[PDB]
Design a protein around this ligand. Structure first.
Ligand SMILES: [N+]
Length: 229
């Protein structure tokens, strides 16, 4: 039973580690994961990489690799859908329906740059749908990615941030601080897509992993880590 080398967006580290234990216990395939930012794997796969499967934190980068013939054509699918959360490390700062955001009664709001970060785009889409973009604009602090957006609500001076639910979840619930989980109607789906790389075209272990991700056991872990299927 061969191993499968997988490139995993760091957003998805904890779930793939849990999936890997079950995947190996149930199939004998050993899962060898590298973790990093989506763009780091994009540059590597373009330049030549050993992976047979790539789990992106977006859907545009797998699609670009397909357009470039660098991964198996037709292999792209959505393995997880991210969830956007309004979060503070302060207990009880964020009320259950997010009225703290909707009032505008706060000093700074941390977000990711929408041009490059899917969880940043979700935030700006939600603010636009609520009519809050212009009046909250002066309070925004923008980071390059969702990791920076989350860190700033902790080590920087923002009381609120639009973060990935997966950043604040443990064991199926928000682990610390306080959050408002943004309804799906307020933004486009935060699709996280996977592809099989040219190297994995005829690799049974690659196909087994990708289909395992589409199964019921994987779905249950994925939900508990803060995603939708
Ligand atoms: N929706």
């Amino acid at each position: 039973a061969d191993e499968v080398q997988v490139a995993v967006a760091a957003n998805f580290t904890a779930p793939i580690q849990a999936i890997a234990k079950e995947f190996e216990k149930d199939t004998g395939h050993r899962l060898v994961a590298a973790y990093g930012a989506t763009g780091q794997f994009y540059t590597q796969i373009k330049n030549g990489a050993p992976f047979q499967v790539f789990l992106s934190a977006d859907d545009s980068t797998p699609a670009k690799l397909e357009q470039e013939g660098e991964v198996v054509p037709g292999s792209r699918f959505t393995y997880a859908i991210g969830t956007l959360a309004l979060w503070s490390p302060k207990a009880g700062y964020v009320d259950a329906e997010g009225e703290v955001l909707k009032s505008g009664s706060f000093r700074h709001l941390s977000i990711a740059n929408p041009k490059t970060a899917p969880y940043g785009l979700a935030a700006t889409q939600a603010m636009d749908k609520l009519g809050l973009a212009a009046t909250l604009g002066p309070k925004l602090v923008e980071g390059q990615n969702i990791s920076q957006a989350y860190q700033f609500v902790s080590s920087g001076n923002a009381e609120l941030g639009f973060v990935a639910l997966s950043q604040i979840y443990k064991d199926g619930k928000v682990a610390t601080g306080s959050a408002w989980i943004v309804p799906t109607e307020l933004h486009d789906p935060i699709r996280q897509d996977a592809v099989i790389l040219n190297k994995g075209k005829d690799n049974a272990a690659a196909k087994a992993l990708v289909d395992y991700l589409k199964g019921a056991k994987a779905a249950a872990l994925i939900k508990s880590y803060g995603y939708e299927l």
